[PDB]
Coordinates of C-alpha atoms in Angstrom, one line a residue:
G1 CA 10.9 14.3 20.3
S2 CA 11.3 10.6 19.9
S3 CA 13.5 8.8 17.5
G4 CA 11.2 6.6 15.4
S5 CA 8.1 6.5 13.2
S6 CA 4.6 5.0 13.2
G7 CA 4.8 3.3 9.8
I8 CA 5.8 -0.4 9.9
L9 CA 7.2 -3.0 7.5
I10 CA 6.5 -6.7 7.6
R11 CA 8.7 -9.1 5.6
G12 CA 7.7 -12.8 4.9
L13 CA 4.0 -13.3 4.6
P14 CA 2.0 -16.5 4.0
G15 CA 0.4 -17.4 0.7
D16 CA -3.0 -16.8 2.3
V17 CA -2.1 -13.4 3.8
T18 CA -5.2 -11.2 3.5
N19 CA -6.1 -7.7 4.7
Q20 CA -8.3 -9.4 7.4
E21 CA -5.1 -11.1 8.8
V22 CA -3.3 -7.8 9.3
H23 CA -6.5 -6.1 10.6
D24 CA -7.0 -8.8 13.2
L25 CA -3.4 -8.7 14.2
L26 CA -3.5 -5.0 14.9
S27 CA -7.2 -5.0 16.0
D28 CA -6.0 -3.6 19.4
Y29 CA -4.6 -0.3 18.1
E30 CA -5.9 2.5 15.9
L31 CA -5.5 1.5 12.3
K32 CA -5.4 4.8 10.4
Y33 CA -4.1 3.1 7.2
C34 CA -3.9 -0.5 6.1
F35 CA -1.9 -1.8 3.2
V36 CA -1.3 -5.4 2.0
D37 CA 1.0 -6.3 -0.9
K38 CA 1.0 -10.1 -1.6
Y39 CA 3.1 -9.6 -4.7
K40 CA 6.3 -8.7 -2.8
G41 CA 5.1 -10.5 0.3
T42 CA 5.0 -7.6 2.8
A43 CA 2.5 -5.4 4.7
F44 CA 2.6 -1.7 5.5
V45 CA 0.5 -0.3 8.3
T46 CA 0.4 3.3 9.6
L47 CA -0.6 3.8 13.3
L48 CA -1.7 6.9 15.1
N49 CA 1.3 7.6 17.4
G50 CA 4.7 6.0 17.8
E51 CA 3.9 4.2 21.0
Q52 CA 1.4 1.9 19.3
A53 CA 3.9 1.3 16.5
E54 CA 6.7 0.3 18.8
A55 CA 4.5 -2.1 20.7
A56 CA 3.3 -3.7 17.4
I57 CA 6.8 -3.9 16.0
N58 CA 8.3 -5.2 19.3
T59 CA 5.8 -8.1 19.4
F60 CA 5.5 -8.6 15.6
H61 CA 9.3 -8.5 15.4
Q62 CA 11.4 -11.7 16.0
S63 CA 8.1 -13.5 15.6
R64 CA 7.1 -16.7 13.8
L65 CA 4.2 -17.9 11.7
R66 CA 3.6 -21.4 10.5
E67 CA 7.1 -22.5 11.3
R68 CA 8.7 -19.5 9.7
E69 CA 10.8 -16.5 10.7
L70 CA 9.1 -13.1 10.4
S71 CA 11.1 -9.8 9.9
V72 CA 9.7 -6.5 11.0
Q73 CA 11.2 -3.0 11.2
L74 CA 10.3 0.7 11.2
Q75 CA 9.4 2.1 7.9
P76 CA 12.3 3.6 5.9
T77 CA 12.7 7.3 4.9
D78 CA 10.1 7.4 2.1
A79 CA 11.2 3.9 1.0
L80 CA 14.2 5.5 -0.7
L81 CA 17.2 3.2 -1.1
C82 CA 20.3 5.4 -0.8
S83 CA 24.0 4.7 -0.3
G84 CA 26.3 6.9 1.8
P85 CA 27.9 7.7 5.2
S86 CA 25.8 8.1 8.3
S87 CA 27.6 10.9 10.1
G88 CA 31.0 12.5 10.6

């Protein structure tokens, strides 16, 4: 199969970041799950397939909002921080 995932991660959100903001941003694809966490300042969204996720991340990535740099990347492996070798 492909090497990726649908889940996404957005870092660096505005003080007025609301669910409506994320919904409108991805109002072109199928939003199976919508999550917005102002506390930390990030937003997690789960799309249907990986194609829609890549397109959203590609555009959302290296993007800017209100004179600010936005960081976006594919969701981690169960949001589990681990330290170790990759391979070999």
